[PDB]
């Protein structure tokens, strides 16, 4: 117990000095109106706060479903083959069996999904970790939608694949952190919202 | 310092929480010093509540001069801010 | 009798009570007795006009 008391009485001062030093080193670093993080001299510390430009208060852990799925399971959960698959129209108010343009849209969707899975598994989270803090709890919003609209699992939906693709693309186009018609502004916007876009596309696959 | 054109503005179109606090405080301070109120009063006596109800109706006659790191700035009306 | 036509500047502080439609008439008279955007002075509420 004496050792414990001594450790307390010393650690208090140690950490007090550490915190004063830490605050003095970064007191001038502030987020600017162009999205960049700079110090009092204008030197850029980061080009986007946290590399995504989000307040740490508002982020919540989300699970990436496509990361740990096998290729077979990934295909099962995301691949739509209207030529071989007919169960899709069983879930829909409108028949889309053997439709060419809809199949083209689905193929573009699946190509983007496979690209996103490749980028996740190879570049971002090669260790296979799926739970990461992102903006917006999308799963909670989906649960809220299921509860609010009394969605009956037995009721065919009036949503067409094109509706889903266009809506998700427009949403992704409305997640603006950086504004500007330049090229590197587009690049930084895409990078900042890349992981969120991957999660959104994995959640809202047709 | 050069003023940016209204069409060229690149900053966020939303009112920041710091901007909201500053705007409410400044308008409340001006009201406390007998600045004419641009909203109908239902018997409120606190200048801060008067400024809040002015804000809800976007009736605060104030601008925000957001400065870019290089010194160029953008003027945003409290009314047009989201 | 050398008379010079010159452009000059002054910094007028205005009380919040005057912040109405007739703000600019008041400033001109004050300038004559003694227009840029009005900078609201932090902590005081006045508006500085150049």
């Amino acid at each position: 117990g004496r050792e414990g008391l001594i450790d307390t009485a010393v650690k208090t001062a140690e950490t007090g000095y550490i915190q004063r030093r830490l605050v003095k080193a970064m007191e001038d670093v502030m987020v600017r109106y162009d999205g960049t993080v700079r110090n009092a001299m204008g030197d850029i510390i980061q080009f986007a706060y946290g590399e995504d430009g989000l307040d740490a208060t508002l982020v919540e852990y989300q699970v990436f479903d496509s990361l740990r799925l096998s290729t077979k399971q990934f295909e099962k959960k995301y691949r739509i083959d209207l030529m071989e698959d007919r169960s899709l129209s069983l879930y829909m108010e409108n028949s889309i069996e053997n439709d060419s343009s809809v199949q083209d849209l689905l193929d573009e969707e699946y190509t983007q999904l496979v690209a996103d899975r490749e980028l996740l598994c190879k570049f971002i989270f090669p260790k296979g970790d799926a739970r990461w803090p992102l903006p917006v709890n999308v799963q909670r919003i989906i649960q809220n939608a299921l509860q609010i609209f009394h969605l009956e699992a037995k009721k065919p939906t009036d949503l067409l694949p094109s509706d889903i693709i266009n809506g998700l693309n427009e949403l992704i186009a409305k997640l603006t952190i950086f504004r500007g018609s330049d090229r590197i502004t587009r690049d930084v916007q895409n990078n900042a919202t890349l992981l969120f876009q991957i999660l959104l596309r994995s959640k809202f696959a047709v | 310092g050069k003023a940016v054109a209204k069409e060229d503005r690149t900053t966020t179109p939303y009112m920041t929480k710091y901007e909201r606090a500053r705007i409410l405080g400044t308008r409340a301070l001006q009201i406390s010093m007998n600045a004419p109120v641009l909203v109908d009063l239902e018997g409120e006596t606190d200048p801060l509540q008067i400024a809040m109800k002015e804000l809800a109706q976007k009736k605060i006659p104030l601008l925000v001069r957001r400065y870019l790191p290089d010194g160029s700035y953008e003027d945003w009306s409290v009314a047009e801010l989201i | 009798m050398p008379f010079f036509l010159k452009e000059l500047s002054l910094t007028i502080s205005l009380h919040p009570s005057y912040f109405g439609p007739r703000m600019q008439d008041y400033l001109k008279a004050k300038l004559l007795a003694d227009i840029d955007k009005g900078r609201v002075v932090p902590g005081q509420g006045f508006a500085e006009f150049e």
């Binding site: 109106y33 | 710091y18 500053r22 705007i23 925000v64 400065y67 009314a79 | 955007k37 609201v40």
Partner: peptide, 15 residues
């Protein structure tokens, strides 16, 4: 809260 400056909009004070 002081990362910006507040100005009057006289266009609104007219109306």
């Amino acid at each position: 809260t002081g990362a910006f400056d507040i100005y009057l909009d006289q266009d609104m004070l007219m109306n």
